[PDB]
Amino acid sequence: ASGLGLPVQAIMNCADNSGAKNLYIASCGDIVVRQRKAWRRKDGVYLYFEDNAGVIVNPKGEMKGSAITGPVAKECADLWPRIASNAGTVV
Amino acid sequence: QNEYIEESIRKHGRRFDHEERKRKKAAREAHDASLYAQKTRGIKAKLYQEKRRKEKI
Amino acid sequence: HFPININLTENGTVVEIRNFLGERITRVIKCLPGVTVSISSAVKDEIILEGNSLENVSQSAANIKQICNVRNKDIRKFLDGIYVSERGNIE
Amino acid sequence: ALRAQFENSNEIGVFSNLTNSYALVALGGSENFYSVFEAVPVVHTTIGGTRIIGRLTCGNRKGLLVPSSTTDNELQHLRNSLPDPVKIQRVDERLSALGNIVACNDYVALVHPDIERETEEIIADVLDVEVFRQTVLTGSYCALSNVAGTINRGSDVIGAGLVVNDWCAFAGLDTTATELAVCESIFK
Amino acid sequence: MRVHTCYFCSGPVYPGHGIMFVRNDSKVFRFCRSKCHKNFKMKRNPRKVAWTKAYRKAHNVPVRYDRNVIATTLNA
Amino acid sequence: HGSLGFLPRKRASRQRGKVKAFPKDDASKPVHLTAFLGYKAGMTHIVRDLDRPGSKMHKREILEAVTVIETPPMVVVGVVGYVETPRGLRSLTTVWAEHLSEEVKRRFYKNWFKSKKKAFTKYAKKYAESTQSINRELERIKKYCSVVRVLAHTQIRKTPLAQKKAHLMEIQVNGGSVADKVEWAREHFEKTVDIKSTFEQNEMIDVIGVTRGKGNAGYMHRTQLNSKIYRIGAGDDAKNASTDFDATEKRITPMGGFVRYGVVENDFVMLNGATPGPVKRVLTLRKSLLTHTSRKALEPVSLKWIDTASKFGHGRFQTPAEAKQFLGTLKK
RNA sequence: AUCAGACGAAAAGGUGUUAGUUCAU
RNA sequence: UCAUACCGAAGCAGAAUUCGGUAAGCUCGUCGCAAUGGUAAUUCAACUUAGUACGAGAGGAACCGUUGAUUCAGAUCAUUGGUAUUUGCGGCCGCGGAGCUAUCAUCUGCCGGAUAACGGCUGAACGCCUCUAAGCCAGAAUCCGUGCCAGAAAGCGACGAUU
RNA sequence: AUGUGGAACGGGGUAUUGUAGAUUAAGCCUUUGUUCCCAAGAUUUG
């Protein structure tokens, strides 16, 4: 990382520049920009979407896509510096 | 440990019954040692016999 | 550090130990028949068990001591526990 | 900004949209951290599976304009839980991080630069503030309080790291103490 | 509990059934049937197919929850 | 073939499920029934909020792909007394009914029409002529017994099946005393039993049944485990498929009947997983041998919306009634 | 004997016995 | 017997764990009983627990729930993607309902004791002590039970009709 | 092996492909519809 709620290999929409309608994976900000399952934040919060919407991001923080649809997660943006460049607004 | 163990012993200490049990276990250790000498098997039996012979001599 | 809470049920037949070094699981020990366990008010955190069977009382004390056993902890450093203090004839 | 329990993550501000009268809370996570997030209507609802109100609700004491991407039914339940003066508006914008991209404080609504003027006005209308499109994580990077201190252990996301109420603020457990004091000075 | 409308077939979209697609422009498309999804994939014009209701025809504020409001909603 | 227990895998002879191990009973437990014969009405995905404290779907709407079982009422026309012996558990005597239905009489026979309908006729005479002999049999059962079961049979005519031999199988009358077991059996004699009374929609059910043969995979009697009930809908109930959230009236049967099964007009139950066997196959629903204490059984079930779309083909509407006004006026 | 017996690691060890002997008190 | 299940020992601060073993888990019927076998799962985790006992603190306790990742087996085609003799249909194609199939889908999947190692309590020999010689024990993915799978073609019982 | 008798079609429903039509259960449902046959034909059985 440059700074998994849903089932494994779930159909996750690549919100990043990959733009895949449903890419195999998931939790929002976990990479995975969004997911059907709620991402239980350590601060007691959740983060999810209607279905799995995990963007493409490498484990080292170098996200494959730099066009994250909507605002990327702030935890994801902090964990993945390219995800921060993918979407200026960090959720 | 060390300084911490000494400070704990001075402040709290240790169970006195454990020391009495340890002395009781020491007598059991001699009985266990005789049982162990009669329970060692295979290569351990030869090693135990060699250790016992060396200790006796 | 963490005080141990002792609860008596069925006229001392069942003894429940809670908050043992921060443990969140309560340990329940059932005394042998013919032995009654009560908390003496003369000495704080003192439990007195009286019965007609010496073997049953000794077995109950051993079970209580075995229940309150420190696991994966230093005996010299962590001295918290429950042990038999004194034993003798009631009369 | 008062440090609140947030476990490992220092972004308690993103989790809970603290406010004087619409202090939206965090749900579906750590019970102790969620209680600290609640501590001022505690809107602890996982709207659309997202309970990070401070990262998805652009507003303040007068009301929080949660993004329309979140579930309306859960938002309606959150609106019912929230006080009547607090209006839970729907932010139908591309930037789904209403709370994190828009620092819609009660006095001034620091909306996202990518958010349109109508979306900026929607956040401003909910919080009864003036719309101001600014960077595009204005809510995350800047505390929405009615000093640019790097909250969340020096992270550039100050508002996401430390929640800011209309008349107070709430930092995270691992948020920078100096930044939290700076946020307190900014929020008076 | 809201029933979505099909993007291609212009019909109700029940949960589970149908196919939901997300576009790169934050556009959500729902198909009532697999044929509608295939037609949408094939770039079929909704007005060019008489099966869809769109061709046949052309040829948000929340409120406080209350018992009376629920009764009014039930009547509507 | 990894599981050595099933090997050698051979097809089960009896299509009907066999309750090899009944749950343990006690006198404190009220007299009641565990196993209930049923049929695979079908299966349908239905949405439901997942109420489970500590879960990551806690109070979250999740679609539940589940299975619905046709469970017509249960008529009992016989009782068996099992006496424990050093060699094993032996049946002391069997007391069938004075009046047997045509369906259960069809079960005793291979054909109904060729025979002269002589099944249990002279027995029906001695039962009516001498009720005291039956009283002695019941008296013999009460004094010498530990296990009491009932010979209950299905009503095929209520079901939409070509089956006409009533499927019959022993069901232990769990609870109470042997005399109390017999008393309940005698009063419920020649009476139907509804599965809604047996299962409280929250109790623990391990469905057993025989699966579907494949051209020895198939016709295997396998006992499913951890399949909780969510709704025992009644056949006369038109609101069974319409819960509180989806108040729009609908029947569990998809329009045009279930897929390869037919229409449901009788009591049905609701459970998850997949049951051994395809649609319209005999299934047995019994109480769990072990008291499953996992939160999956403990959690209350508040079903959100039943689907009834045309699963056959591609059904875009769950009920015709709404689709009539939703879609334009038909040319007809 | 919790490997008897019955028909080489085998030397020995034994809180293992059986009979015990001898010597100390 | 690498890990793991079990514990014991070791500073093993806790985490991280190591080693030691234990441990091969990895007449015609109708309806029933179960002698005998195979085998209940199987491999491991994380969060909660507690973000704390320990620990200067940080990192991280037993137990609880949750998320699981599996293997294999059990299912079913509802969700799911196709295959598809509706080879059905519209223009050789464009595909395909049903049916079936899936680490291609959705899923479901054990038990209580005996004890092993292991440490005991009590109690002789050895007026005491003494896991032990009498006894009472604690303690295992092991074993046995248990559950499941069959059913003694040459097992059995109850019940029906009976040329 | 004389009646929800079944078996067949005539179908309806039905979705498919598909631009509404045809197949229309074939392992989709179902029939107040129709006819056919049959209160069987032999064998086995104390």
Side-chain angles (χ1 to χ4, degrees), chain A residues 1 3 5 7 10 15 19-20 26 29 38 44 53-54 59 61 65 67 70-71 73 77 81 84 87-88, chain B residues 13 26-27 30 33 37 42 45, chain C residues 3 12 22 33-34 42 51 61-62 81 88, chain D residues 1 4 13 23 26 28-29 39 41 48-49 54 59 63 67 83 85 97 99 103 109 113 124 139 143 148-149 154 159-161 169 171-172 177 181, chain E residues 11-12 15-16 18 46 50 54 58 62 71 76, chain F:
Chain F
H1 293 266
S3 68
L4 302 90
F6 292 164
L7 266 293
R9 284 163 44 180
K10 36 177 292 183
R11 58 210 293 260
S13 61
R14 189 204 302 178
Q15 184 175 354
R16 170 174 46 81
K18 179 185 185 304
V19 191
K20 301 187 186 174
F22 276 97
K24 186 53 191 175
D25 51 351
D26 49 303
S28 303
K29 167 197 296 186
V31 301
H32 83 93
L33 279 286
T34 41
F36 203 99
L37 282 176
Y39 288 85
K40 187 132 168 290
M43 71 222 282
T44 290
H45 64 300
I46 59 187
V47 298
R48 173 192 169 272
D49 48 344
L50 258 291
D51 185 8
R52 185 188 300 104
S55 179
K56 181 242 312 165
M57 278 34 58
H58 180 40
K59 307 307 293 179
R60 258 48 156 267
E61 179 34 74
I62 297 292
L63 171 64
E64 292 185 345
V66 287
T67 311
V68 48
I69 307 304
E70 162 66 273
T71 56
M74 192 32 34
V75 183
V76 53
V77 289
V79 291
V80 269
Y82 289 120
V83 50
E84 227 302 318
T85 75
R87 292 183 279 186
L89 186 57
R90 197 193 59 87
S91 57
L92 179 63
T93 11
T94 308
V95 188
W96 307 82
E98 178 177 327
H99 328 89
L100 298 183
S101 308
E102 173 185 5
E103 303 191 17
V104 57
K105 287 191 171 185
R106 283 166 167 271
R107 174 58 61 182
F108 305 119
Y109 266 135
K110 297 306 164 301
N111 91 78
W112 190 221
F113 294 73
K114 172 184 183 65
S115 172
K116 311 307 167 63
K117 288 64 170 180
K118 311 163 64 53
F120 290 66
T121 70
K122 274 74 66 179
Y123 167 28
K125 306 300 298 305
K126 56 203 268 174
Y127 204 130
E129 294 145 352
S130 174
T131 56
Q132 54 91 14
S133 61
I134 271 75
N135 300 341
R136 166 59 202 169
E137 300 165 6
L138 267 61
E139 163 196 1
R140 190 199 332 270
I141 293 303
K142 287 175 291 186
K143 195 168 172 180
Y144 325 139
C145 218
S146 176
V147 165
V148 184
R149 309 192 196 172
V150 297
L151 292 302
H153 70 269
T154 66
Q155 322 110 351
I156 53 92
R157 205 58 44 83
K158 295 178 176 170
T159 81
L161 300 172
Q163 274 328 94
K164 285 197 269 285
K165 304 160 51 61
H167 295 73
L168 186 144
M169 80 64 179
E170 285 76 350
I171 330 179
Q172 249 207 150
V173 277
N174 331 117
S177 69
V178 170
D180 185 28
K181 290 173 183 59
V182 164
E183 165 266 351
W184 182 100
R186 178 181 60 259
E187 63 186 0
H188 285 74
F189 217 65
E190 302 181 16
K191 279 168 45 190
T192 214
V193 174
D194 294 0
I195 196 172
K196 201 183 310 299
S197 176
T198 77
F199 311 148
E200 206 203 5
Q201 185 262 333
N202 55 358
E203 316 288 336
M204 189 27 175
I205 290 315
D206 43 357
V207 41
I208 72 186
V210 172
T211 179
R212 166 178 31 87
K214 299 307 302 307
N216 200 336
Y219 295 157
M220 293 324 249
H221 180 273
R222 291 305 177 270
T223 69
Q224 298 280 357
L225 195 37
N226 299 153
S227 295
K228 185 199 179 310
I229 307 305
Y230 318 78
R231 163 165 303 180
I232 298 104
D236 55 347
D237 187 11
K239 313 287 292 187
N240 39 32
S242 74
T243 91
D244 310 358
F245 310 91
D246 56 328
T248 67
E249 182 269 330
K250 39 191 300 182
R251 183 59 202 269
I252 190 57
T253 296
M255 81 144 198
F258 268 97
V259 189
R260 255 296 292 183
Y261 161 81
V263 300
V264 184
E265 51 275 11
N266 325 59
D267 297 2
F268 68 93
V269 313
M270 167 44 27
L271 80 186
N272 69 341
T275 43
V279 271
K280 61 178 190 60
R281 180 165 291 257
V282 44
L283 299 172
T284 303
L285 317 178
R286 52 176 303 273
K287 298 293 203 310
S288 62
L289 278 160
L290 182 140
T291 57
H292 198 62
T293 182
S294 177
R295 279 83 207 106
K296 48 182 301 181
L298 308 184
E299 61 192 356
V301 170
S302 48
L303 195 276
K304 292 280 293 191
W305 156 79
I306 299 276
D307 191 26
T308 54
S310 160
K311 309 305 190 299
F312 56 102
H314 295 261
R316 36 189 300 183
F317 293 93
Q318 66 313 319
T319 153
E322 50 96 1
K324 300 312 179 185
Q325 44 262 14
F326 186 88
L327 181 285
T329 301
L330 186 59
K331 52 158 299 184
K332 310 303 181 180

